[PDB]
């Protein structure tokens, strides 16, 4: 509609310990549904959405063992990269891996992702063809060369084209009521003096799902302002999201400005402006 299943994996080395901290979170669209944290109480794959609690112990046992296996491999990978970069074992380093599938309205794979970063920088990524890799420096070239030798691409491609899509379909069925919905935003404009003769107008969108949204401001008769303060879309904590966008305008000219709110749940945008009480 479209939809996606994505996993986000993070391994952090700890100079002065054995095991790195290893975390996995899984998402369908904008909803986190599973988490594994090696340092947790306890270190198993566990639910983060009510609807996944529908899976039997077999599911939970198998994902926990896969998480544990991946953690061991990420431990190895961190040590391997220390070597590639000639780095010492007295500092912390990070490996991140994001992967998953986007599927279209007909339930078919639109694109697959499989990419890693070392210390927050692009390391290696599976190309859109799902057949070849992009490296970013000498170390990642070695990794790329190794993955070509063992045909890793075909293993990841098989997953992304098959099980990833199929599991996404299962999850969409399990969590249909919350995943397959649009809650449109409710919006209002607030007014806050900024100086003697300037006012901050803030256009709020609240209670919306999914997270994608766009707010625009403009002076009536002109193109959209670029001079706009925004915040990153943020979780309300109840499965919906919030966002706001602000402009500073002259006192007494508040109503010459208009905010529009666009969202998948709105056939037409909401149109708002400051209304004195």
């Amino acid at each position: 509609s479209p939809h996606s299943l994505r996993y986000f994996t993070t391994a952090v080395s700890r100079p002065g310990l054995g095991e790195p901290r290893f975390i996995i979170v899984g998402y369908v669209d904008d909803t986190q549904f599973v988490r594994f944290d090696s340092d947790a109480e306890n270190p198993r794959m566990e639910p983060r959405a009510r609807w996944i609690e529908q899976e039997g112990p077999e599911y939970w046992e198998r994902e926990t063992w896969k998480a544990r296996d991946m953690g061991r491999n990420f431990r190895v990978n961190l040590r391997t990269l220390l070597g590639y970069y000639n780095q010492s074992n007295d500092e912390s380093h990070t490996l991140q891996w994001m992967y998953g599938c986007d599927v279209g309205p007909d339930g078919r794979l639109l694109r697959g992702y499989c990419q890693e970063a070392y210390d927050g920088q692009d390391y290696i990524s599976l190309n859109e063809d799902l057949r070849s890799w992009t490296a970013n420096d000498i170390a990642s070239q070695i990794s790329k060369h190794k993955s070509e030798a063992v045909d890793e691409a075909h293993q990841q491609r098989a997953y992304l084209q098959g099980p990833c899509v199929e599991w996404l379909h299962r999850y969409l069925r399990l969590g249909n009521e919350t995943l397959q919905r649009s809650d449109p935003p409710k919006a209002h404009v607030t007014h806050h003096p900024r100086s003697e003769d300037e006012v901050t107008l803030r256009c709020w969108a609240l209670g919306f799902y999914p997270a994608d949204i766009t707010l625009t401001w403009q002076l009536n008769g002109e193109e959209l302002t670029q001079d706009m303060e925004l915040v990153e879309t943020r979780p309300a904590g109840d499965g919906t999201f919030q966002k706001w966008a602000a402009v500073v305008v002259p006192l007494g000219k508040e109503q010459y400005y208009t905010c529009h709110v666009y969202h998948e749940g709105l056939p037409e945008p909401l149109t708002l402006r400051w209304e004195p009480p």
Partner: peptide, 9 residues
């Protein structure tokens, strides 16, 4: 469900 294996870098 998660991928079966990760890359060996």
């Amino acid at each position: 469900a998660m991928a079966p294996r990760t890359l060996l870098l």
